Amino acid sequence: SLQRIVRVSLEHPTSAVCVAGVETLVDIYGSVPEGTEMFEVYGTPGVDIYISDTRRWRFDATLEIIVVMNSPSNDLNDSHVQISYHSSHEPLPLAYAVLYLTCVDISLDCDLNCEGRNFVDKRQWVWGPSGYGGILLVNCDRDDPSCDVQDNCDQHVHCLQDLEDMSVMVLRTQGPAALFDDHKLVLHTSSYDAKRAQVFHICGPEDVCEAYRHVLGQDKVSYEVPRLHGDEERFFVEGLSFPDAGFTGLISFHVTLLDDSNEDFSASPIFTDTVVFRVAPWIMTPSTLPPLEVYVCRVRNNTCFVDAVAELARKAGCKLTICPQRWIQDEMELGYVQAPHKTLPVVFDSPRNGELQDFPILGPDFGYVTREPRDRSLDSFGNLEVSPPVVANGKEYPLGRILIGGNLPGSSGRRVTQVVRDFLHAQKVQPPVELFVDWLAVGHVDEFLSFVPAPDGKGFRMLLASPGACFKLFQEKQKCGHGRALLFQGVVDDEQVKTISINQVLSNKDLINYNKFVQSCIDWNREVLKRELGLAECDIIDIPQLFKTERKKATAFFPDLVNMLVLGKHLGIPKPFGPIINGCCCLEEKVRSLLEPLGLHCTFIDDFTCGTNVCRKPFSFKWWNMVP
Amino acid sequence: SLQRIVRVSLEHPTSAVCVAGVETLVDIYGSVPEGTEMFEVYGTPGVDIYISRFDATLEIIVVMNSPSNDLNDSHVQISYHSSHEPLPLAYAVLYLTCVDISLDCDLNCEGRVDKRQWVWGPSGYGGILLVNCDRDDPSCDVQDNCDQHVHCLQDLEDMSVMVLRTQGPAALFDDHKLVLHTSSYDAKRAQVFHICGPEDVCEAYRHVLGQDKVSYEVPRLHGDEERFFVEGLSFPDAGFTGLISFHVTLLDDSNEDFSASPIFTDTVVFRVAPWIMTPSTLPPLEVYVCRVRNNTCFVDAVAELARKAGCKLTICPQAENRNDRWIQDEMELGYVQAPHKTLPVVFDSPRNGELQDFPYKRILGPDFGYVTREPRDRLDSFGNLEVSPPVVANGKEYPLGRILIGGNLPGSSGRRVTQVVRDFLHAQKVQPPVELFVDWLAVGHVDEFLSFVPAPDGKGFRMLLASPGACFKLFQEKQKCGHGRALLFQGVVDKTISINQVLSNKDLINYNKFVQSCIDWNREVLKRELGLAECDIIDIPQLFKTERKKATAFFPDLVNMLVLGKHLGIPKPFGPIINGCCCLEEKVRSLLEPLGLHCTFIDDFTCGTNVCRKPFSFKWWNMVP
Ligand SMILES: [Ca+2]
Ligand SMILES: [Ca+2]
Ligand SMILES: [Ca+2]
Ligand SMILES: [Ca+2]
Ligand SMILES: [Ca+2]
Ligand SMILES: [Ca+2]
Ligand SMILES: [Ca+2]
Ligand SMILES: [Ca+2]
Ligand SMILES: [Ca+2]
Ligand SMILES: [Ca+2]
Ligand SMILES: [Cl-]
Ligand SMILES: [Cl-]
């Protein structure tokens, strides 16, 4: 309703400004003429008058007059309302009161992203399919081909491609120009919001980068808008901060009309319109999403690994980037930000000191984000993974759920710094899950947990390392007369690492009992994952994997099978140098019998003789349609 | 829901611990004996066994409901048989020790249960924690929550109780550790003392969780129940939603060669009670005034009004850092409330110095807490801060009222309320603030044009708005009756003006029309955000003049009154004297006395007044924000 009160006087005609579609209540300042018993209200064409007027003579009471104008005025004071006060004793009216009106239309709008929900409250941002609201990206992608830092570090536009990342804000003002000579039009935002976004007002041709004037920014919280382009001014909004521990992700911009007609008095508010943007969060891509680019580091002695990765990537049809030497898999994670107008892959760099090949990856349409710890004296993103879309606890996680290696209550050190946990939780669209990894020497999630695509059941199957599975496999192979088959029969007379037989493995009671303890450690996480991801036993696959002891913690006995490179249907699995039976590794044949029915192709790669990371396509599901 | 997996082996008997009422799934580590199989499961008394017998991918589930008396005093035996021979193929044994572990608090349940959540509303639940900011110790000079010790037994009356109940064989806890822990973030905002000796000894309450203590191995000294006392350190703020969690975790440390493993975890979630403002319609308990030299008459009138009411009166001394009206502008009086204790709490305006709010017991003393903030930049006057009675608006209900904050006009250079204060007030979440337009005033305090009084009719209150139009009407009507020669400021013993001269000053009348429009903007904002109608509002006649092109009171501000129940102390308007009475006083009387209120007009020009009030009967945890 946004109702408004305007007072008229008997001795002077008053002049006021109203906004189209806004109810204006006409009251009196001072007494009515002595003797008033009835009143009449008349208005010029275009002025709708209500009484809480066709019937002119109206009895006097504590009743309100409401005037409405629906179309903006062409000239100042081109319309008016006249109240006539009469007495029942005399035919001549007691007095006249005049309210001249100027009607204006003011609207601050953005792309509310409306295809399933209209004319709703522009001051809110609603999640879900029936939601709406502008979306703002963090301009963290360095589009300028002659700049060394991110595009949102300065207060200027230095390339026209940069505008593709920004969001558009349109200010429509319909009215007589002379009015805006003494009625100021102020675009403003809060200081808090000012430190997290910037606004450029376009003032010349679009071709000119210098025409995009920095209007709202780090210290600019208000700006008087000159109406240079007639009835529409254009602003470009540029995000500066992802959602964080203290930043819910909402940023507001307002336009306020201020009456400054009288230089002796003070300014006064007349109308205010608001737009609310939500900063798009950083979203992780699980291994079930289609790949676009694989990253590898060719060092000395790893040529075979890089070659096998290149062969797998060409068999999958995705790009491959050989990186010079930091760490491809542990010092960075690859996600994306998504807005209706542009999607940007974004690298989350592990907190360190230096620009180390991730900042110098950071190029056009490829953004960068990182954090700085509180105690600058680290984080390994091998403790960080994400699940495919799931449904659990009656809730739906269509972008999956983040999986973070946790710390055991009472442990001395922390495995993930507080800044990273706060960032991941603040993204709000992939609610994290704590896992139990302190039993591992390193503690990375991919040492016991992975996901692969499948056509049956849900879109995926969860691979869990299982000492019990390998125990069963070796027992069955021994019962079949293959107990003398040797593990690690890779290279003889040219590489000196002793071999071991199935009999020797099954006879080592310490090894079997320790792997039973490891199996229980993995069973804890198995139950936690079944609960937090809504999984059943048919969703899980126990991949045979044995562990040994290092510093009283768990390490892989043979290469980690669960830690594979997933590229669509193509799997690059670390080659297990297991028992050779009939000319084949029984571990390879077991993994094949487990995975190939799912339509996946298994290529076993020697990573024993690294670093691999994948940029993937975003979810088809739009994050703004999720209900957190 | 909290299912657990335990694996048995054919060659070694396994031993495990289970928690009462928690399903433990029994699986096999390794192969079953070679050949066609069937299995039988039997369990000792106290062991409930279910099956979800032919062999398939089917699960065995074991449950124990009562804790064990001895280690491994119960067991489950799986027997593998073949259909070809009567003799069983093999046996697998799982010895079990059942334990009951529970970390609990007073969940505040009389109208309603997941212990890991905190739910608002009448159908809600959850523990409540106060901020121990009240200085109960008569020999400490600072707040009670500054150290890591308990120095007086009355301090425990502010804390919340956390009970850890563990039923099981003692020998188990020789190799199964019991760890009470909380997050670092939560650790910096609460403290936990574990009681270890007699309650009489303050030194027996040992600091176990605090600023840097995030975990603690608890020794079971008192049998099956240990008690902890939780003490809040921080109100909700911009980055603190107000929730604090504590967990107990059982850790298997049986094998020194392996690493520890989790077994069970229970959680308690506390909500820190917010700071709540008290509107003028609430019953008073204590009035505060500052007696200086030459202002004795004002203090006397306030004392007489407080004696006419049933509340206490405190004469406050003035320190070196002196704002003129420091009783009302440098401090606000609210409260925090938990089912076990209610504390009045003074919000001290952010400044430099300890000035009678921090030192002296009538404000910061036993069962009277203190809270303040420090600005980030280089300002705050709590005259820009008020609060409304309980209201209903926008389809929502505000049973603790809504805070009203004087706002800044878009484009203004300075801010009248710093960001820390706005963040604090918004974080309290139970009195959602409303921004007002006050930049038209020279000072800009809310009480320059707005007030509330109790009423028996309607919503229980009336909103008083200063109105130049009302005074205009009053003076015009008095002039029509032949009283235009009546003089304002006649009863003055220190410059008189007549009704005719006031009505003849066209600049003054136009300026007061502009002021009336400025107040009308706020009137519409308040009608919208508080669900008010015209019958809820009263236009108190008030004229304004210009100072530095801003609005100041022409005669004393009538709206800025002291409300004590039915008794009103209104600033005396030295208006036109007619028939021996001030027509402004008679007008205010005709407006207010029908509401059952008593009007005493007090000369405060010839100050500072503040009121501590009774808390709302409505409990804040029953509100749904
Ligand atoms: Ca730029
Ligand atoms: Ca850019
Ligand atoms: Ca850095
Ligand atoms: Ca771009
Ligand atoms: Ca990772
Ligand atoms: Ca203490
Ligand atoms: Ca205390
Ligand atoms: Ca201070
Ligand atoms: Ca106390
Ligand atoms: Ca106040
Ligand atoms: Cl790409
Ligand atoms: Cl008291």
UniProtKB/Swiss-Prot annotation, chain B:
GO CC term (a single one): nucleoplasm
Record carries keyword Hydrolase: yes
Signal peptide: none
Entry's family note: Belongs to the protein arginine deiminase family.
The protein, known as: Protein-arginine deiminase type-3
Protein function: Catalyzes the deimination of arginine residues of proteins.
Source species of the chain: Homo sapiens (Human)
Disease: Uncombable hair syndrome 1: A form of uncombable hair syndrome, a condition characterized by scalp hair that is impossible to comb due to the haphazard arrangement of the hair bundles. A characteristic morphologic feature is a triangular to reniform to heart shape on cross-sections, and a groove, canal or flattening along the entire length of the hair. Most individuals are affected early in childhood and the hair takes on a spun-glass appearance with the hair becoming dry, curly, glossy, lighter in color, and progressively uncombable.
Keywords: Calcium, Cytoplasm, Disease variant, Hydrolase
